[PDB]
From Swiss-Prot, chain A:
Disruption phenotype: Severe facial dysgenesis and impaired forebrain development around mid-gestation, absence of Shh expression and decreased cell proliferation in the ventral neural tube, and aberrant expression of morphogens Fgf8 and Bmp4. Reduced expression of homeobox protein Six3 at 8.0 dpc in the prospective forebrain and impaired Shh expression at the ventral midline with resulting midline formation defects and holoprosencephaly. At 9.5 dpc, loss of Shh in the ventral anterior diencephalon and increased Bmp4 expression in the dorsal forebrain. The chain holds residues 1499 to 2580 of 4660 of the full protein. The gene is Lrp2. Binds plasminogen, extracellular matrix components, plasminogen activator-plasminogen activator inhibitor type I complex, apolipoprotein E-enriched beta-VLDL, lipoprotein lipase, lactoferrin, CLU/clusterin and calcium. Forms a multimeric complex together with LRPAP1. Interacts (via PxLPxI/L motif) with ANKRA2 (via ankyrin repeats). Interacts with LRP2BP. Interacts (via NPXY motif) with DAB2; the interaction is not affected by tyrosine phosphorylation of the NPXY motif. Interacts with MB. Interacts with BMP4. Belongs to the LDLR family. This is Low-density lipoprotein receptor-related protein 2.
Length: 1082, 167, 83
């Protein structure tokens, strides 16, 4: 009980723990940090006690008794040894130095004052005295030991654990002549401890009256036997009881899995300027804030983490990006913002540290100009002058490898230096002298320049892979990953060299931690706090600018925020993204859609209600297919179509904002359906079903009451229809091969399509006629989606990985315009704006479905040139009032489907359902219908042994299943008698054909059958027929009382699952599933 | 030539006019220069990924993998365009097949057949040089071949290789 | 090199003659070079207690040349002109 955490951070691979019960202290060793460390037993204050000449410390033991005050540890690095020290580290000695190779674990015997030590290469257990001058062997030259790890003692017994044998062993601690196994099949036993009062003897505590402020450590030093110690980052005072806190700067080093603190005195080799960060992955960059003593780093995917230099707080602080991992960090300490770099999204972004609610936006993204970000790798900021600097590898689309400058709100862009920058690492800024430093790995140089783009020069030569840079005072510090070195030089000339650390693998970038104060560096956002609603960003001249988070826009007051209402939404297989039509606005117009299960193919929008709908496809995972809607602010996410999707998935989404309807194309292997679903309801209908045609991309026009679709199957075409598909016309039948994209213009009455197999963009008028071409050539190789807005068409190209805008009139030959560049796996684009979705009656030509769904109960359809609505039923049939729905009184089919009963019509071209689908307990296998009471009788399987019978009523209003014979065997066969009002059933589990009365009152058994399945009855001739699929499968005839029995068919039957009788012809039909054939007889 | 060559595709030579043509994909350009390292210029703009180049007669032919196209232009100015094939996936480089004859292009190795023992390689000024296969060295007569007897042998996990101490 | 021991062996070229000249567990002979002009056999050990050692062509004598300032000696060359 009472599981609680002592150390929350700074541990990498703890080999051994010791606890000092007198001093209320805890000690531990670490292999990777190569350290022995001490802290209060609650973990509050920690210190590094031994770091010199420590390589692989594995074992640790203590004697805290008054006058002993001694600790022992083992090292299995080169020159393996066992060492003794004072519990404060003030005295150090080596006590076992020979006949030792892989010394694993240590234990102490307090009455005898002996040290017990164990070796895994020479395979022994030995004991010696505290000075190592008496030595003896307990177990030696014995094959019992294979790979011992840990050791404990109790009375005259010694216990240990072995990793080779996966075993825990007991022996006699003096000669080993008695041996036993405590455990036999442990996964791997690493550590062992023995618990009894005798293992922690009592003794006086010197520290009980001491006044040390942070740590009091037992000491072997006469007369007071204690000493005061300070934590990491602290100093000790000449009073020798108090500690002070070092304000001096220190250096932060980043490594693939660790972050370290180093001291700017190169002769101090201990890495203890701060508690290390010991659990990172893919470390590249780090930032710090001194006003709260925090260190910040990035964690995949899209998360930022912060920790305090004392280890006291460690948390995941904000999500950075839904689209990919961030790489580079910069911090503004005046406005309290963190700028970061996202290469996969090709963006530079800002996040707010102030307040309880996180806000973030995108400042710069790839827009096809050379000035935008191509592939950014390093970022620096100047808050006082409101400037941002970054290093970029460029892109093949046109962004050069460069050092670039901007204003901290993104409103200006400049290229300062380019050329001879093939492999370009981070950029750093000297703010006092206003000079930028960067590193070119392809030439092994560190280069310097002015912030205005002048005076480029080389400062350091002959490097191999300079990964990290930082400038502080008169000195420049850099790290090299091939030389495995951290070095310091003088920034004026680079003419002196000092080496801080060497042989460091997996080096990464460096920072320097110092007291940078906001009062001196103050700017507009610091001078005008609480000005902006969401984000404040400085700009040159002491001025400030207000910024609004993703999905929101800034309002003409310059301080307030309001959602976007005019943007374009683009689909790509991994995501859905929104962009502003203002080419200078690099912000995200909507919170992106990204994550597990997203394989988006099409997106549509409902502007009035503020929703975006999209479809997802997967050939290997059923649940990953469907239609889903979200809001541009990411608030509410829901699934609208998940049931009944074909193998080829949904390949179309159109939304009718007037009627509140959604149209989609559902593609099976050998056929396709066009379906409609009423939003916020469980109403779904099939409007078209076709096999030789292949409707794929669908768009809807409620203003002119038309529904258009594009088909790129065999005999490709573009078609027009009504909102219920009751009319079909073909607009384009020639010069069309792979039409994949369909857009409609309300202002001109034109529909636009793109074909990537002809490399063409074209328009045709909805009434038909000639066809016009808008863009054509070797260019425009793979246009996949198109939309129309104003005097412009906006389309997406897969090969060029670009989003283009051009003028929608044929004959224009101006070069296109680019909105975003380097977007992978593109799919179509649509637009979100009130103009494209009018809701006024005068603008919608008085559509009847605009108000209260036209009064139709289920579905409302507005047909052309009709002043009244037309109504459709998702289930049932439509009545004389023309607006309500009721269940059919004609003749139809009923069939069971797992947990439900469903209805079907004899006419294949009728897509009405006679009644809504009914849900029942278990799995239903039986159907018979009673014409007097208008009810259905069915049989249910509840488990592999238990069955049930039930009846449900059709026309007596709404009804639910009612149960008969709540306990029978697995039953699948039912027949009803209309002359006697009796029920007959086929009990498989109990090998019997049974009869029952309509009310469930009276029960009888008619026959015993090996494997009975089906029953047929003729009451006006007193005969019964059934089928048996047991060995010697047969069809048998009997009398309704069972008094005669004869086989009618006993040849060429294997699995006669179905039986039927036709009284118009007096013919008996049966079906066999093994012979796979249907036969008829008399 | 160097500089502004981040993504550099094949190089081809016009032998009659002695001019080198190359393509820079990072800028979408076909560039031309003299064989002596002078008169660099851009001849074709606005390409996407020019993968293949060939020059024949008055015409320059190139293939683009993103436009999925093979196109012909006039090598003097690039001011006329003809399209040979389109919608071709996975395009790669092009050559032109024609009757290039040795009699006109003769050199030292053609004029002195059977001179070298193993390999003959031309050099400027009509002269020829003799070359010897891997593992062998050339002998002071300038024509014969004999095994190396002074070299350093280096080991790497995938291979063992030998290098001459003559840099 | 085995898991817990190492052998130094000699084989006569173009013959099926093979002999073991040294077998050691706590030392880790790895890189070996030979000098027939001065009749010495040198090796480098980068195990625990790393060292460089000299011996005879049958390993019947052993001496340590470098025992300090040596951690991971992986490479051994001999010069006939300077010794
Ligand atoms: C379907 O239900 C949603 C709510 O789940 C309705 O959305 C609301 O629409 C009104 C009017 O535009 C907005 O003021 C609300 O903010 C919306 N709610 C939410 C949670 O965003 C929607 O109108 C309904 N109808 C359709 C066709 O979607
Ligand atoms: C560390 O080892 C070196 C070499 O044996 C020795 O000179 C030095 O005194 C040792 N220092 C400590 C603190 O053990
Ligand atoms: C240890 O083993 C010996 C031999 O079986 C036996 O005589 C002795 O009693 C054992 N000791 C204990 C404590 O069981
Ligand atoms: C802390 O100690 C270091 C020497 O180890 C010294 O350089 C520094 O100035 C001290 N700082 C304070 C605040 O005492
Ligand atoms: C984390 O920080 C908060 C606020 O300063 C503090 O109350 C809390 O104690 C910290 N966590 C730990 C484990 O100390
Ligand atoms: C919309 O999302 C909010 C959370 O942001 C939730 O509280 C609310 O209930 C949601 N609205 C509906 C209708 O589900
Ligand atoms: C439906 O289409 C036919 C052609 O198939 C056309 O003649 C008819 O006019 C259309 N319906 C209406 C109401 O125009
Ligand atoms: C099928 O019916 C069983 C029993 O009613 C139910 O548990 C299961 O979820 C159903 N599965 C499907 C795919 O309908
Ligand atoms: C069927 O159940 C009845 C009633 O428990 C029992 O008498 C009969 O023996 C069972 N028969 C079979 C074949 O399980
Ligand atoms: C098969 O059925 C016929 C007709 O009822 C009968 O005469 C014959 O004996 C049956 N044979 C077998 C093997 O059951
Ligand atoms: C062999 O080594 C010993 C030292 O171990 C040395 O005294 C002796 O001289 C050596 N043998 C010869 C023949 O020199
Ligand atoms: Ca062992
Ligand atoms: Ca194409």
């Amino acid at each position: 009980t009472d599981k609680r955490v002592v150390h929350d951070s700074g541990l990498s691979l703890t080999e051994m723990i010791a606890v000092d019960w007198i001093g209320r202290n805890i000690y531990w060793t670490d292999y990777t940090l190569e350290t022995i460390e001490v802290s209060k037993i609650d973990g509050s204050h920690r210190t590094v006690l031994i770091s010199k000449n420590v390589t692989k410390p594995r074992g640790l033991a203590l004697d805290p008794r008054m006058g002993d005050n001694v600790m022992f540890w083992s090292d299995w690095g080169h020159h393996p040894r066992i060492e003794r020290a004072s519990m404060d580290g003030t005295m150090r000695t080596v006590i076992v130095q020979e006949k030792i190779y892989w010394p694993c674990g240590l234990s102490i015997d307090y009455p005898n004052r002996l040290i017990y030590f164990m070796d895994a290469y020479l395979d022994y257990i030995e004991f010696c005295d505290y000075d190592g001058q008496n030595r003896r062997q307990v177990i030696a030259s014995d094959l019992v030991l294979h790979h011992p790890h840990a050791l404990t003692l109790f009375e005259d017994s010694v216990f240990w654990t072995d990793r080779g044998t996966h075993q825990v062993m007991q022996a006699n601690k003096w000669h080993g002549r008695n041996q036993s196994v405590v455990m036999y099949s442990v996964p791997q036993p690493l550590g062992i401890i023995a618990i009894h009062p005798s293992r922690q003897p009592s003794s006086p505590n010197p520290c009980a009256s001491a006044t040390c402020s942070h740590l009091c450590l037992l000491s072997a030093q006469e007369p007071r036997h204690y000493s005061c110690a300070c934590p990491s980052g602290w100093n000790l005072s000449d009073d020798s009881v108090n500690c002070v806190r070092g304000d001096q700067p220190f250096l932060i080093s980043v490594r693939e899995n660790v972050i370290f603190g180093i001291s700017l005195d190169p002769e101090v080799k201990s890495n203890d300027a701060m508690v290390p960060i010991s659990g990172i992955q893919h470390g590249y960059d780090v930032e710090f804030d001194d006003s709260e003593q925090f260190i910040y780093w990035v964690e995949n995917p899209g998360e930022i983490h912060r920790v305090k230099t004392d280890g006291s707080n460690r948390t995941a602080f904000a999500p950075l990006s839904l689209l990919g991992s961030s790489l580079g960090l910069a911090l503004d300490w005046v406005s309290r913002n963190i700028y970061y770099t996202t290469p996969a999204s090709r963006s530079i972004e800002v996040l707010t540290l102030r307040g309880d609610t996180r806000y973030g936006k995108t400042l710069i993204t790839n827009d096809g100009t050379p000035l935008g970000v191509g592939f950014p790798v390093g970022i620096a900021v100047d808050p006082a002058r409101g400037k941002l600097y970054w290093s970029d590898h460029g892109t093949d689309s046109g962004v050069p490898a460069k050092i670039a400058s901007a204003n901290m709100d993104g409103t200006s862009l400049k290229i300062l230096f380019t050329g001879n920058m093939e492999h370009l690492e981070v950029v750093t800024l000297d703010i006092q002298e206003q000079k930028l430093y960067w590193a070119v790995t392809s030439r092994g140089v560190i280069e310097r320049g002015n912030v205005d783009g002048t005076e480029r020069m080389i400062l350091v030569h002959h490097l191999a892979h300079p990964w990290g840079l930082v400038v502080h005072g008169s000195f420049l510090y850099y790290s090299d990953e091939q030389y495995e070195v951290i070095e310091r030089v003088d920034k004026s000339s680079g003419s002196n060299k000092v080496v801080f650390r060497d042989n460091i693998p997996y080096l990464r970038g460096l920072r320097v931690y110092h007291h940078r104060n906001a009062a001196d560096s103050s700017n507009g956002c610091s001078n005008n706090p609480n000005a902006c609603q969401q984000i404040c960003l400085p700009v040159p001249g002491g001025m400030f600018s207000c910024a609004c988070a993703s999905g929101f826009k800034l309002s003409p007051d310059g301080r307030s925020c309001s959602p976007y209402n005019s943007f374009i939404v683009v689909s790509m297989l991994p995501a859905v993204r929104g962009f502003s039509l203002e080419l200078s606005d690099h912000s995200e117009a909507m919170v992106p859609v990204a994550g597990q299960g997203r394989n988006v193919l099409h997106a549509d929008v409902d502007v009035a209600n503020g929703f975006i709908y999209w479809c997802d496809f997967s050939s290997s995972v059923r649940s990953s297919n469907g239609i889903r809607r979200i809001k541009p602010n990411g608030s509410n996410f829901t699934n609208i179509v998940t049931y009944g999707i074909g193998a080829n998935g949904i390949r179309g989404v159109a939304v009718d904002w007037v009627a509140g309807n959604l149209y989609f194309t559902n593609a099976f292997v050998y056929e396709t359906l066009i379906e409609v679903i009423r939003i916020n309801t469980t109403y779904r209908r099939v409007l078209l079903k076709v096999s030789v045609d292949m409707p794929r991309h669908i768009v809807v026009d409620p203003k002119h009451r038309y529904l258009f679709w594009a088909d790129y199957g065999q005999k490709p075409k573009i078609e027009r229809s009504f909102l219920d598909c009751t009319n079909r016309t073909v607009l384009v039948s020639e010069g069309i091969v792979t039409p994949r994209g369909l857009a409609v213009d309300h202002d001109t009455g034109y529909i636009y399509w793109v074909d990537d197999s002809l490399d063409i963009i074209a328009r045709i008028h909805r009434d038909g006629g000639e066809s016009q071409v808008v863009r054509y050539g070797s260019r425009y190789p793979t246009p996949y989606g198109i939309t129309v807005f104003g005097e412009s068409i906006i389309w997406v190209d897969r090969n060029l990985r670009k989003v283009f805008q051009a003028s929608k009139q044929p004959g224009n030959t101006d070069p296109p315009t680019v909105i975003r560049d380097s977007i992978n796996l593109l799919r179509d684009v649509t637009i979100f704006d009130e103009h494209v979705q009018p809701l006024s009656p005068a603008e919608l030509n008085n559509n009847p479905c605009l108000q209260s769904n036209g009064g139709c109960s289920h579905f409302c359809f507005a047909l052309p040139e009709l002043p009244t609505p037309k109504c459709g039923c998702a289930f049932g049939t439509l009545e004389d009032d023309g607006k309500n729905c009721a269940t059919s009184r004609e003749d139809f089919l009923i069939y069971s489907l797992n947990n439900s009963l469903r209805s079907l019509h004899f006419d294949p071209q009728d897509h009405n359902l006679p009644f809504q689908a009914i849900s029942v307990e278990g799995m239903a296998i039986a159907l018979d219908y009673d014409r007097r009471n208008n009810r259905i009788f069915f049989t249910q399987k509840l488990n592999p042994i238990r069955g049930q019978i039930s009846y449900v009523n059709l026309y007596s209003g709404a009804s639910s299943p009612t149960i008969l014979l709540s306990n029978i065997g697995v039953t699948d066969g039912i027949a009803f008698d209309w002359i006697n009002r009796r029920i007959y059933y086929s009990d498989f589990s109990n090998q019997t054909i049974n009869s029952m009365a309509e009310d469930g009152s009276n029960r009888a058994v008619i026959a015993r059958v090996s494997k009975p399945r089906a029953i047929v009855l003729d009451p006006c001739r007193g005969y019964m027929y059934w089928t048996d699929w047991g060995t010697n499968a047969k069809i048998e005839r009997a009398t309704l009382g069972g008094n005669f029995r004869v086989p009618i068919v006993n040849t060429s039957l294997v699995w006669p699952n179905g039986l039927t009788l036709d009284l118009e012809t007096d013919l008996l039909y049966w079906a066999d599933a093994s012979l796979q054939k249907i036969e008829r007889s008399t």
